[PDB]
Amino acid sequence: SNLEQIDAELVLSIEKLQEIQDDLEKINEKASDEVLEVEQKYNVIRKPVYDKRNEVIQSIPGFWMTAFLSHPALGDLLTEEDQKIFKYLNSLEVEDAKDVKSGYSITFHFTSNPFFEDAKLTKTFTFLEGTTKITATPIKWKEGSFFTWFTHDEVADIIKEDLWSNPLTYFN
Amino acid sequence: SNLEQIDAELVLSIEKLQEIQDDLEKINEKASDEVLEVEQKYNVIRKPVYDKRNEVIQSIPGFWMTAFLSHPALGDLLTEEDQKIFKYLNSLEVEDAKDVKSGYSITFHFTSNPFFEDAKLTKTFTFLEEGTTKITATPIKWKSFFTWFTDADEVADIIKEDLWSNPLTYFNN
Ligand SMILES: [Ca+2]
Ligand SMILES: [Ca+2]
Ligand SMILES: [Ca+2]
């Protein structure tokens, strides 16, 4: 009687619920794709602004080193010899992957210097299951430390979200 | 005599940097607005699907209780007495403000129980237009997890983004 109908309804309702979650999964995937496309679009928009900013910074001889040193979290990470190398740092760069979700890289651009041969040291973060893999430029030291960073990465997030976003508020 | 002593080109480079940062600020705000618009669009689209999910759930006894009690993180947060209480949970409900940005609330609907008076225990997260946000909650009217209802959030994130989003995966296990 009523018990059989409730029983049958219960079996049916579990299946319909699996259908509803499948619908919700596809809706959540469309929405997070759409949020991602907005961020991809605005990385396009910001790119020439970051370029102009890099151009202006060429006129301020120790800008990036100075902003990095004035940042409360980052500044105390430069041992005194690190700061002599940082004298040759002339540009920092952060770029998301084209699709955003799959990572980004951080690059320290170095002028010609006696410590190492590289013009740039890059640390890359790839991740697309929650996990992430890191790669870094193996430093081509010359014959004659914060630089251990080039091998849960809080220095990366500070650089990416604070210093890279507005280094001027630490420079000022 | 601060900027007067400084080389003109250094002075003007800072001014131009400040102006570029202002441009970047405006760009970031157009990006926020555009993302907010996407969240609002899909809040509307999901609403009748959540309603249909709530309707179907009425035919499954103890659904929300079983999903909460089977969640690996959330389950690890009940006392044995907290589990005596949750046997009386009939419904979970997460609702964002009509604009997404204002915040959201999480509501636990309990049936008549011997532990407290309330039928709804609600924890509302209000995002203020100026910085810090205001967190309100229900004062339990008793006749631990329920320490979560303090106006002072890992639990709220797990509920909003995990349990509420797909409870059926924890009903099965
Ligand atoms: Ca369908
Ligand atoms: Ca679209
Ligand atoms: Ca002077």
Side-chain angles (χ1 to χ4, degrees):
Chain A
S1 169
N2 287 319
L3 189 60
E4 299 159 313
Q5 177 253 322
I6 287 151
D7 182 65
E9 232 181 33
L10 163 54
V11 177
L12 168 73
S13 274
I14 280 160
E15 292 156 28
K16 291 182 56 40
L17 185 40
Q18 186 59 79
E19 254 166 26
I20 284 162
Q21 290 296 153
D22 291 333
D23 292 339
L24 280 174
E25 186 199 80
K26 292 189 182 55
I27 286 154
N28 295 334
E29 271 180 61
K30 272 162 219 273
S32 69
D33 288 350
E34 293 229 52
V35 171
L36 213 63
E37 290 190 353
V38 172
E39 294 308 332
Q40 290 159 4
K41 155 194 179 165
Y42 278 95
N43 285 348
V44 171
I45 292 182
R46 277 182 299 244
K47 177 61 166 179
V49 179
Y50 285 137
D51 285 344
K52 282 165 177 28
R53 189 174 73 173
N54 193 50
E55 172 173 18
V56 169
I57 288 171
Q58 298 312 301
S59 289
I60 306 180
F63 181 82
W64 279 114
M65 169 190 49
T66 307
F68 191 101
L69 276 175
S70 306
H71 189 285
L74 302 161
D76 47 46
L77 305 182
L78 304 189
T79 71
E80 208 69 66
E81 190 167 40
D82 292 359
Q83 298 174 35
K84 169 51 200 305
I85 307 180
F86 264 63
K87 212 172 221 189
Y88 302 86
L89 177 67
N90 81 88
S91 202
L92 180 78
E93 183 191 16
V94 179
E95 38 185 326
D96 293 322
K98 181 87 175 259
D99 63 54
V100 181
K101 62 183 175 182
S102 88
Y104 69 89
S105 57
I106 302 185
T107 301
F108 287 69
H109 288 102
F110 285 93
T111 189
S112 194
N113 73 81
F115 297 97
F116 51 72
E117 214 56 80
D118 306 272
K120 61 183 193 172
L121 301 188
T122 286
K123 192 175 192 175
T124 296
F125 301 77
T126 297
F127 41 84
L128 214 44
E129 66 291 329
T131 178
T132 189
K133 62 158 290 177
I134 302 173
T135 67
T137 312
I139 303 168
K140 213 157 309 186
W141 296 108
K142 285 183 183 181
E143 295 198 349
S145 185
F146 171 78
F147 285 89
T148 61
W149 190 64
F150 293 90
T151 309
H152 38 289
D153 195 329
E154 202 56 43
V155 165
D157 304 337
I158 293 168
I159 290 172
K160 166 186 184 65
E161 303 298 3
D162 267 357
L163 190 77
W164 165 254
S165 182
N166 191 339
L168 180 62
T169 57
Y170 307 99
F171 182 87
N172 286 343
Chain B
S1 45
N2 170 212
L3 288 182
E4 288 106 304
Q5 74 195 32
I6 294 186
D7 181 80
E9 203 189 313
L10 296 170
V11 169
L12 298 164
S13 296
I14 292 297
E15 293 299 296
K16 295 202 284 198
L17 282 186
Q18 180 61 66
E19 185 181 352
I20 291 173
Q21 290 308 143
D22 292 341
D23 290 341
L24 282 166
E25 200 191 289
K26 268 129 71 196
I27 288 163
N28 289 332
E29 291 165 343
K30 287 167 185 184
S32 291
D33 294 350
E34 219 166 299
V35 167
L36 176 60
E37 194 178 349
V38 167
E39 320 272 24
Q40 284 165 356
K41 170 193 174 175
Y42 280 102
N43 160 87
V44 175
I45 282 167
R46 274 187 297 248
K47 180 60 181 171
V49 186
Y50 281 135
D51 292 336
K52 193 175 302 171
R53 196 180 68 175
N54 186 41
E55 167 159 359
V56 159
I57 282 173
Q58 307 308 311
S59 299
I60 310 175
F63 174 81
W64 278 112
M65 177 214 55
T66 295
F68 191 96
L69 254 78
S70 310
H71 189 295
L74 288 178
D76 276 340
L77 289 180
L78 290 317
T79 323
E80 278 210 25
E81 176 176 17
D82 286 26
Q83 285 162 40
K84 304 186 183 57
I85 297 164
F86 260 85
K87 300 180 69 179
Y88 291 103
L89 182 73
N90 62 71
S91 191
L92 182 68
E93 177 192 30
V94 184
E95 197 179 19
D96 280 274
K98 212 196 66 70
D99 64 40
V100 170
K101 51 173 176 198
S102 285
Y104 65 93
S105 53
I106 295 178
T107 298
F108 293 74
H109 299 250
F110 299 87
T111 39
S112 187
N113 69 80
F115 292 100
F116 48 77
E117 302 290 344
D118 307 277
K120 299 182 183 182
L121 295 182
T122 295
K123 193 159 143 60
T124 290
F125 299 75
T126 303
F127 306 143
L128 261 57
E129 301 78 3
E130 303 192 335
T132 301
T133 77
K134 173 61 198 155
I135 293 186
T136 55
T138 296
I140 322 294
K141 299 196 168 189
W142 308 91
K143 303 291 178 80
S144 176
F145 175 79
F146 295 96
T147 313
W148 182 71
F149 293 98
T150 298
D151 288 348
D153 208 322
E154 51 154 348
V155 172
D157 207 16
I158 296 177
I159 295 160
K160 193 177 184 332
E161 295 289 328
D162 184 13
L163 184 72
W164 167 254
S165 178
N166 197 327
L168 178 69
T169 56
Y170 312 114
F171 189 72
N172 301 339
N173 297 347

PDB file of all heavy atoms in Angstrom, chain B residues 33-59:
ATOM      1  N   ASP B  33      33.876  43.636 -10.999  1.00  0.00           N
ATOM      2  CA  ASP B  33      32.495  43.827 -11.401  1.00  0.00           C
ATOM      3  C   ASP B  33      32.079  42.776 -12.417  1.00  0.00           C
ATOM      4  O   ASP B  33      30.969  42.246 -12.343  1.00  0.00           O
ATOM      5  CB  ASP B  33      32.294  45.232 -11.967  1.00  0.00           C
ATOM      6  CG  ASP B  33      32.483  46.349 -10.908  1.00  0.00           C
ATOM      7  OD1 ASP B  33      32.580  46.057  -9.692  1.00  0.00           O
ATOM      8  OD2 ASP B  33      32.513  47.541 -11.303  1.00  0.00           O
ATOM      9  N   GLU B  34      32.970  42.424 -13.350  1.00  0.00           N
ATOM     10  CA  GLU B  34      32.587  41.494 -14.406  1.00  0.00           C
ATOM     11  C   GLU B  34      32.441  40.073 -13.861  1.00  0.00           C
ATOM     12  O   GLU B  34      31.545  39.330 -14.278  1.00  0.00           O
ATOM     13  CB  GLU B  34      33.608  41.562 -15.549  1.00  0.00           C
ATOM     14  CG  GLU B  34      32.958  41.471 -16.903  1.00  0.00           C
ATOM     15  CD  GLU B  34      33.849  41.853 -18.066  1.00  0.00           C
ATOM     16  OE1 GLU B  34      34.341  42.999 -18.153  1.00  0.00           O
ATOM     17  OE2 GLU B  34      34.043  40.986 -18.937  1.00  0.00           O
ATOM     18  N   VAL B  35      33.309  39.691 -12.922  1.00  0.00           N
ATOM     19  CA  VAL B  35      33.195  38.410 -12.239  1.00  0.00           C
ATOM     20  C   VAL B  35      31.938  38.382 -11.374  1.00  0.00           C
ATOM     21  O   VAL B  35      31.191  37.391 -11.364  1.00  0.00           O
ATOM     22  CB  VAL B  35      34.457  38.143 -11.402  1.00  0.00           C
ATOM     23  CG1 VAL B  35      34.241  36.985 -10.444  1.00  0.00           C
ATOM     24  CG2 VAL B  35      35.636  37.855 -12.297  1.00  0.00           C
ATOM     25  N   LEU B  36      31.687  39.466 -10.629  1.00  0.00           N
ATOM     26  CA  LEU B  36      30.463  39.549  -9.838  1.00  0.00           C
ATOM     27  C   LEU B  36      29.242  39.315 -10.717  1.00  0.00           C
ATOM     28  O   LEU B  36      28.347  38.559 -10.347  1.00  0.00           O
ATOM     29  CB  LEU B  36      30.359  40.905  -9.121  1.00  0.00           C
ATOM     30  CG  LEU B  36      29.056  41.143  -8.329  1.00  0.00           C
ATOM     31  CD1 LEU B  36      28.874  40.093  -7.237  1.00  0.00           C
ATOM     32  CD2 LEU B  36      28.957  42.557  -7.736  1.00  0.00           C
ATOM     33  N   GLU B  37      29.220  39.907 -11.912  1.00  0.00           N
ATOM     34  CA  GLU B  37      28.079  39.724 -12.799  1.00  0.00           C
ATOM     35  C   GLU B  37      27.891  38.257 -13.189  1.00  0.00           C
ATOM     36  O   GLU B  37      26.751  37.779 -13.302  1.00  0.00           O
ATOM     37  CB  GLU B  37      28.240  40.598 -14.037  1.00  0.00           C
ATOM     38  CG  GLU B  37      26.963  40.730 -14.851  1.00  0.00           C
ATOM     39  CD  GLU B  37      27.124  41.651 -16.056  1.00  0.00           C
ATOM     40  OE1 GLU B  37      28.162  42.356 -16.143  1.00  0.00           O
ATOM     41  OE2 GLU B  37      26.203  41.669 -16.912  1.00  0.00           O
ATOM     42  N   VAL B  38      28.996  37.530 -13.405  1.00  0.00           N
ATOM     43  CA  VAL B  38      28.913  36.104 -13.718  1.00  0.00           C
ATOM     44  C   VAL B  38      28.365  35.318 -12.527  1.00  0.00           C
ATOM     45  O   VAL B  38      27.555  34.398 -12.702  1.00  0.00           O
ATOM     46  CB  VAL B  38      30.284  35.553 -14.161  1.00  0.00           C
ATOM     47  CG1 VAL B  38      30.262  34.023 -14.182  1.00  0.00           C
ATOM     48  CG2 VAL B  38      30.709  36.095 -15.538  1.00  0.00           C
ATOM     49  N   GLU B  39      28.811  35.641 -11.304  1.00  0.00           N
ATOM     50  CA  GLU B  39      28.285  34.956 -10.123  1.00  0.00           C
ATOM     51  C   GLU B  39      26.792  35.212  -9.963  1.00  0.00           C
ATOM     52  O   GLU B  39      26.036  34.316  -9.566  1.00  0.00           O
ATOM     53  CB  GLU B  39      29.004  35.404  -8.850  1.00  0.00           C
ATOM     54  CG  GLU B  39      30.484  35.618  -8.934  1.00  0.00           C
ATOM     55  CD  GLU B  39      31.280  34.362  -8.666  1.00  0.00           C
ATOM     56  OE1 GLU B  39      30.731  33.253  -8.861  1.00  0.00           O
ATOM     57  OE2 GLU B  39      32.465  34.488  -8.267  1.00  0.00           O
ATOM     58  N   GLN B  40      26.351  36.441 -10.232  1.00  0.00           N
ATOM     59  CA  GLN B  40      24.934  36.745 -10.104  1.00  0.00           C
ATOM     60  C   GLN B  40      24.109  35.978 -11.125  1.00  0.00           C
ATOM     61  O   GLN B  40      23.035  35.454 -10.800  1.00  0.00           O
ATOM     62  CB  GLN B  40      24.707  38.242 -10.239  1.00  0.00           C
ATOM     63  CG  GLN B  40      25.106  38.971  -9.001  1.00  0.00           C
ATOM     64  CD  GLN B  40      25.228  40.452  -9.229  1.00  0.00           C
ATOM     65  OE1 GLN B  40      25.080  40.938 -10.352  1.00  0.00           O
ATOM     66  NE2 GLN B  40      25.501  41.186  -8.159  1.00  0.00           N
ATOM     67  N   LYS B  41      24.599  35.902 -12.362  1.00  0.00           N
ATOM     68  CA  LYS B  41      23.888  35.191 -13.418  1.00  0.00           C
ATOM     69  C   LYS B  41      23.661  33.735 -13.039  1.00  0.00           C
ATOM     70  O   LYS B  41      22.570  33.192 -13.243  1.00  0.00           O
ATOM     71  CB  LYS B  41      24.684  35.296 -14.722  1.00  0.00           C
ATOM     72  CG  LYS B  41      24.196  34.413 -15.863  1.00  0.00           C
ATOM     73  CD  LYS B  41      25.222  34.345 -16.996  1.00  0.00           C
ATOM     74  CE  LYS B  41      24.804  33.347 -18.064  1.00  0.00           C
ATOM     75  NZ  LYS B  41      25.717  33.346 -19.243  1.00  0.00           N
ATOM     76  N   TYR B  42      24.680  33.090 -12.481  1.00  0.00           N
ATOM     77  CA  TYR B  42      24.585  31.675 -12.180  1.00  0.00           C
ATOM     78  C   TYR B  42      23.940  31.399 -10.831  1.00  0.00           C
ATOM     79  O   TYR B  42      23.440  30.291 -10.621  1.00  0.00           O
ATOM     80  CB  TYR B  42      25.974  31.028 -12.289  1.00  0.00           C
ATOM     81  CG  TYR B  42      26.278  30.770 -13.738  1.00  0.00           C
ATOM     82  CD1 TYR B  42      27.129  31.615 -14.470  1.00  0.00           C
ATOM     83  CD2 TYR B  42      25.655  29.728 -14.408  1.00  0.00           C
ATOM     84  CE1 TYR B  42      27.359  31.397 -15.808  1.00  0.00           C
ATOM     85  CE2 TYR B  42      25.889  29.499 -15.740  1.00  0.00           C
ATOM     86  CZ  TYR B  42      26.737  30.334 -16.443  1.00  0.00           C
ATOM     87  OH  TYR B  42      26.953  30.090 -17.783  1.00  0.00           O
ATOM     88  N   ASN B  43      23.925  32.377  -9.925  1.00  0.00           N
ATOM     89  CA  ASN B  43      23.050  32.277  -8.762  1.00  0.00           C
ATOM     90  C   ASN B  43      21.595  32.164  -9.201  1.00  0.00           C
ATOM     91  O   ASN B  43      20.848  31.327  -8.682  1.00  0.00           O
ATOM     92  CB  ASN B  43      23.279  33.480  -7.839  1.00  0.00           C
ATOM     93  CG  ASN B  43      22.130  33.729  -6.872  1.00  0.00           C
ATOM     94  OD1 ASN B  43      22.082  33.157  -5.780  1.00  0.00           O
ATOM     95  ND2 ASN B  43      21.205  34.611  -7.260  1.00  0.00           N
ATOM     96  N   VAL B  44      21.187  32.964 -10.191  1.00  0.00           N
ATOM     97  CA  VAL B  44      19.823  32.867 -10.716  1.00  0.00           C
ATOM     98  C   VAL B  44      19.592  31.499 -11.354  1.00  0.00           C
ATOM     99  O   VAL B  44      18.567  30.849 -11.122  1.00  0.00           O
ATOM    100  CB  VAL B  44      19.555  34.003 -11.720  1.00  0.00           C
ATOM    101  CG1 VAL B  44      18.190  33.840 -12.364  1.00  0.00           C
ATOM    102  CG2 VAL B  44      19.691  35.370 -11.042  1.00  0.00           C
ATOM    103  N   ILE B  45      20.545  31.043 -12.174  1.00  0.00           N
ATOM    104  CA  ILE B  45      20.354  29.801 -12.916  1.00  0.00           C
ATOM    105  C   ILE B  45      20.291  28.603 -11.975  1.00  0.00           C
ATOM    106  O   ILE B  45      19.530  27.660 -12.211  1.00  0.00           O
ATOM    107  CB  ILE B  45      21.467  29.662 -13.976  1.00  0.00           C
ATOM    108  CG1 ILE B  45      21.154  30.558 -15.174  1.00  0.00           C
ATOM    109  CG2 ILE B  45      21.639  28.209 -14.415  1.00  0.00           C
ATOM    110  CD1 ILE B  45      22.332  30.744 -16.135  1.00  0.00           C
ATOM    111  N   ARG B  46      21.062  28.621 -10.893  1.00  0.00           N
ATOM    112  CA  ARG B  46      21.082  27.472 -10.008  1.00  0.00           C
ATOM    113  C   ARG B  46      19.854  27.408  -9.106  1.00  0.00           C
ATOM    114  O   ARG B  46      19.554  26.333  -8.574  1.00  0.00           O
ATOM    115  CB  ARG B  46      22.366  27.481  -9.166  1.00  0.00           C
ATOM    116  CG  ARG B  46      23.556  26.820  -9.869  1.00  0.00           C
ATOM    117  CD  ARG B  46      24.804  26.668  -8.976  1.00  0.00           C
ATOM    118  NE  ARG B  46      25.332  27.959  -8.542  1.00  0.00           N
ATOM    119  CZ  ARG B  46      26.490  28.489  -8.922  1.00  0.00           C
ATOM    120  NH1 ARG B  46      27.308  27.853  -9.750  1.00  0.00           N
ATOM    121  NH2 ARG B  46      26.829  29.667  -8.453  1.00  0.00           N
ATOM    122  N   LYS B  47      19.126  28.519  -8.947  1.00  0.00           N
ATOM    123  CA  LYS B  47      18.109  28.600  -7.898  1.00  0.00           C
ATOM    124  C   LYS B  47      16.972  27.602  -8.098  1.00  0.00           C
ATOM    125  O   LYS B  47      16.643  26.883  -7.139  1.00  0.00           O
ATOM    126  CB  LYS B  47      17.599  30.042  -7.784  1.00  0.00           C
ATOM    127  CG  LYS B  47      16.533  30.242  -6.707  1.00  0.00           C
ATOM    128  CD  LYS B  47      17.084  29.870  -5.346  1.00  0.00           C
ATOM    129  CE  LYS B  47      16.041  30.035  -4.259  1.00  0.00           C
ATOM    130  NZ  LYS B  47      16.521  29.457  -2.970  1.00  0.00           N
ATOM    131  N   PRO B  48      16.349  27.483  -9.278  1.00  0.00           N
ATOM    132  CA  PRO B  48      15.343  26.421  -9.458  1.00  0.00           C
ATOM    133  C   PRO B  48      15.924  25.016  -9.470  1.00  0.00           C
ATOM    134  O   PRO B  48      15.175  24.057  -9.249  1.00  0.00           O
ATOM    135  CB  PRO B  48      14.694  26.765 -10.804  1.00  0.00           C
ATOM    136  CG  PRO B  48      15.730  27.576 -11.516  1.00  0.00           C
ATOM    137  CD  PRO B  48      16.446  28.351 -10.463  1.00  0.00           C
ATOM    138  N   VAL B  49      17.219  24.847  -9.715  1.00  0.00           N
ATOM    139  CA  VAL B  49      17.796  23.514  -9.577  1.00  0.00           C
ATOM    140  C   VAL B  49      17.959  23.156  -8.106  1.00  0.00           C
ATOM    141  O   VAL B  49      17.671  22.024  -7.702  1.00  0.00           O
ATOM    142  CB  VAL B  49      19.130  23.402 -10.340  1.00  0.00           C
ATOM    143  CG1 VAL B  49      19.635  21.959 -10.304  1.00  0.00           C
ATOM    144  CG2 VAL B  49      18.948  23.869 -11.768  1.00  0.00           C
ATOM    145  N   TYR B  50      18.400  24.107  -7.278  1.00  0.00           N
ATOM    146  CA  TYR B  50      18.421  23.848  -5.839  1.00  0.00           C
ATOM    147  C   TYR B  50      17.018  23.553  -5.300  1.00  0.00           C
ATOM    148  O   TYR B  50      16.852  22.664  -4.461  1.00  0.00           O
ATOM    149  CB  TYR B  50      19.048  25.015  -5.086  1.00  0.00           C
ATOM    150  CG  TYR B  50      20.550  25.001  -5.142  1.00  0.00           C
ATOM    151  CD1 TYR B  50      21.266  26.168  -5.419  1.00  0.00           C
ATOM    152  CD2 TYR B  50      21.261  23.818  -4.960  1.00  0.00           C
ATOM    153  CE1 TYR B  50      22.632  26.164  -5.474  1.00  0.00           C
ATOM    154  CE2 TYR B  50      22.658  23.810  -5.037  1.00  0.00           C
ATOM    155  CZ  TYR B  50      23.325  24.988  -5.287  1.00  0.00           C
ATOM    156  OH  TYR B  50      24.706  25.006  -5.360  1.00  0.00           O
ATOM    157  N   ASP B  51      16.007  24.298  -5.768  1.00  0.00           N
ATOM    158  CA  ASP B  51      14.633  24.061  -5.334  1.00  0.00           C
ATOM    159  C   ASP B  51      14.199  22.644  -5.675  1.00  0.00           C
ATOM    160  O   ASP B  51      13.658  21.931  -4.827  1.00  0.00           O
ATOM    161  CB  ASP B  51      13.685  25.082  -5.968  1.00  0.00           C
ATOM    162  CG  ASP B  51      13.910  26.500  -5.449  1.00  0.00           C
ATOM    163  OD1 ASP B  51      14.439  26.664  -4.323  1.00  0.00           O
ATOM    164  OD2 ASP B  51      13.554  27.459  -6.170  1.00  0.00           O
ATOM    165  N   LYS B  52      14.473  22.203  -6.904  1.00  0.00           N
ATOM    166  CA  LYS B  52      14.152  20.835  -7.297  1.00  0.00           C
ATOM    167  C   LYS B  52      14.935  19.826  -6.468  1.00  0.00           C
ATOM    168  O   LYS B  52      14.402  18.777  -6.095  1.00  0.00           O
ATOM    169  CB  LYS B  52      14.427  20.652  -8.789  1.00  0.00           C
ATOM    170  CG  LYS B  52      13.850  19.396  -9.398  1.00  0.00           C
ATOM    171  CD  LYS B  52      14.083  19.365 -10.908  1.00  0.00           C
ATOM    172  CE  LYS B  52      13.465  20.582 -11.602  1.00  0.00           C
ATOM    173  NZ  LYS B  52      13.851  20.707 -13.057  1.00  0.00           N
ATOM    174  N   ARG B  53      16.190  20.132  -6.133  1.00  0.00           N
ATOM    175  CA  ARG B  53      16.938  19.220  -5.272  1.00  0.00           C
ATOM    176  C   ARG B  53      16.303  19.121  -3.885  1.00  0.00           C
ATOM    177  O   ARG B  53      16.199  18.024  -3.316  1.00  0.00           O
ATOM    178  CB  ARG B  53      18.390  19.653  -5.151  1.00  0.00           C
ATOM    179  CG  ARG B  53      19.289  18.573  -4.596  1.00  0.00           C
ATOM    180  CD  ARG B  53      20.731  19.043  -4.494  1.00  0.00           C
ATOM    181  NE  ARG B  53      20.906  20.090  -3.487  1.00  0.00           N
ATOM    182  CZ  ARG B  53      22.084  20.597  -3.129  1.00  0.00           C
ATOM    183  NH1 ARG B  53      23.199  20.156  -3.697  1.00  0.00           N
ATOM    184  NH2 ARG B  53      22.147  21.540  -2.197  1.00  0.00           N
ATOM    185  N   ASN B  54      15.867  20.258  -3.330  1.00  0.00           N
ATOM    186  CA  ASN B  54      15.200  20.253  -2.033  1.00  0.00           C
ATOM    187  C   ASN B  54      13.915  19.424  -2.083  1.00  0.00           C
ATOM    188  O   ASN B  54      13.616  18.666  -1.150  1.00  0.00           O
ATOM    189  CB  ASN B  54      14.910  21.694  -1.602  1.00  0.00           C
ATOM    190  CG  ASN B  54      14.332  21.793  -0.194  1.00  0.00           C
ATOM    191  OD1 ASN B  54      14.762  21.089   0.725  1.00  0.00           O
ATOM    192  ND2 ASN B  54      13.347  22.676  -0.018  1.00  0.00           N
ATOM    193  N   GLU B  55      13.150  19.543  -3.174  1.00  0.00           N
ATOM    194  CA  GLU B  55      11.906  18.790  -3.286  1.00  0.00           C
ATOM    195  C   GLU B  55      12.171  17.287  -3.270  1.00  0.00           C
ATOM    196  O   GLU B  55      11.562  16.550  -2.491  1.00  0.00           O
ATOM    197  CB  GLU B  55      11.148  19.203  -4.551  1.00  0.00           C
ATOM    198  CG  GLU B  55      10.011  18.253  -4.906  1.00  0.00           C
ATOM    199  CD  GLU B  55       8.951  18.859  -5.821  1.00  0.00           C
ATOM    200  OE1 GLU B  55       9.066  20.048  -6.183  1.00  0.00           O
ATOM    201  OE2 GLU B  55       7.981  18.139  -6.169  1.00  0.00           O
ATOM    202  N   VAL B  56      13.091  16.821  -4.119  1.00  0.00           N
ATOM    203  CA  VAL B  56      13.440  15.404  -4.206  1.00  0.00           C
ATOM    204  C   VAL B  56      13.941  14.871  -2.869  1.00  0.00           C
ATOM    205  O   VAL B  56      13.642  13.729  -2.492  1.00  0.00           O
ATOM    206  CB  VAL B  56      14.479  15.210  -5.334  1.00  0.00           C
ATOM    207  CG1 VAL B  56      15.258  13.916  -5.174  1.00  0.00           C
ATOM    208  CG2 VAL B  56      13.788  15.255  -6.691  1.00  0.00           C
ATOM    209  N   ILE B  57      14.682  15.693  -2.118  1.00  0.00           N
ATOM    210  CA  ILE B  57      15.257  15.274  -0.845  1.00  0.00           C
ATOM    211  C   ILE B  57      14.184  14.924   0.192  1.00  0.00           C
ATOM    212  O   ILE B  57      14.451  14.142   1.114  1.00  0.00           O
ATOM    213  CB  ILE B  57      16.234  16.380  -0.346  1.00  0.00           C
ATOM    214  CG1 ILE B  57      17.564  16.285  -1.098  1.00  0.00           C
ATOM    215  CG2 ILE B  57      16.505  16.296   1.158  1.00  0.00           C
ATOM    216  CD1 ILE B  57      18.554  17.441  -0.810  1.00  0.00           C
ATOM    217  N   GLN B  58      12.966  15.467   0.057  1.00  0.00           N
ATOM    218  CA  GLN B  58      11.894  15.157   1.010  1.00  0.00           C
ATOM    219  C   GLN B  58      11.536  13.681   1.025  1.00  0.00           C
ATOM    220  O   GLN B  58      10.952  13.215   2.007  1.00  0.00           O
ATOM    221  CB  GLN B  58      10.619  15.952   0.708  1.00  0.00           C
ATOM    222  CG  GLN B  58      10.857  17.443   0.594  1.00  0.00           C
ATOM    223  CD  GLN B  58      11.595  17.984   1.803  1.00  0.00           C
ATOM    224  OE1 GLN B  58      11.212  17.715   2.943  1.00  0.00           O
ATOM    225  NE2 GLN B  58      12.668  18.735   1.565  1.00  0.00           N
ATOM    226  N   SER B  59      11.857  12.939  -0.034  1.00  0.00           N
ATOM    227  CA  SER B  59      11.502  11.526  -0.104  1.00  0.00           C
ATOM    228  C   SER B  59      12.621  10.616   0.367  1.00  0.00           C
ATOM    229  O   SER B  59      12.477   9.391   0.297  1.00  0.00           O
ATOM    230  CB  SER B  59      11.098  11.149  -1.532  1.00  0.00           C
ATOM    231  OG  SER B  59       9.957  11.888  -1.947  1.00  0.00           O
TER     232      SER B  59
END
